Amino acid sequence: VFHKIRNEDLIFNESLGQGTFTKIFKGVRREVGDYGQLHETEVLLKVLDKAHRNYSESFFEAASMMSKLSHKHLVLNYGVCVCGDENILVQEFVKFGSLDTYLKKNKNCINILWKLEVAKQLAAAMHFLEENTLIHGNVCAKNILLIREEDRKTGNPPFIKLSDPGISITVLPKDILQERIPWVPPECIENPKNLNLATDKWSFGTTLWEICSGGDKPLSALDSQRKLQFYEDRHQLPAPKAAELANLINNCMDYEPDHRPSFRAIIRDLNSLF
């Protein structure tokens, strides 16, 4: 399972935000690194809400999935803190934060080549998970972290990482799942038992829409019931202004789960634009 980190070696600093039933903090970890050298390491601290301790099993399982695998595009888990009654995950601190905020604030300063490079990296991470038959379950721009910005001294591309999915949608309350439309696929709204590898293909299409839409949230103007009726009438998301990926978005967001393309095919589609 996880590595145990003493709270004496952990300092909680600024709050970065809130997840689903969690609070997110920037922290510092005091550790012995390679060659016995003492290090002061920036860490991300995810604390499960005390009013939602019942989700602790799903809270830690979501991080345990990512730790059992090793890949350059997956966020590293350092371990779990020992505070007695608290549930605290200690993860690597990515310096440029989540993709969805980065897309908003750098709206004008992002062309199609930047978005394609990030899309290819996300597709590579999802292909890696698909080859391991591992279901993420919460693919969204919020859960994409920017390790490195694009460098214009070289043209060096940005580098992204995919974080853990958090508390699974199989146990989340109904109202939370419907707030997550259109990231949650239609078959999961009908029955969260339908969580499948095909789920991540749908959510990837929604995340691709986010990347092309400069940080806009799809269907944000619709309330929950209107989000449900969006699936009932089986509508598709509007084509983004930068519409080079609109066909891939709709292909991924197929209402028939069996027809959504494999990430091998998605990558091939992505690579057809250079």
Ligand SMILES: CCN(CC)C(=O)c1ccc(Nc2nc(OCC3CCCCC3)c3[nH]cnc3n2)cc1
């Ligand atoms: C000045 C403005 N910036 C951007 C430059 C920052 O403050 C900032 C924020 C976050 C990181 N880093 C980060 N963020 C995560 O989650 C993303 C956050 C989760 C909950 C709230 C929303 C974002 C992470 N998960 C696992 N390792 C993570 N590392 C770096 C910088």
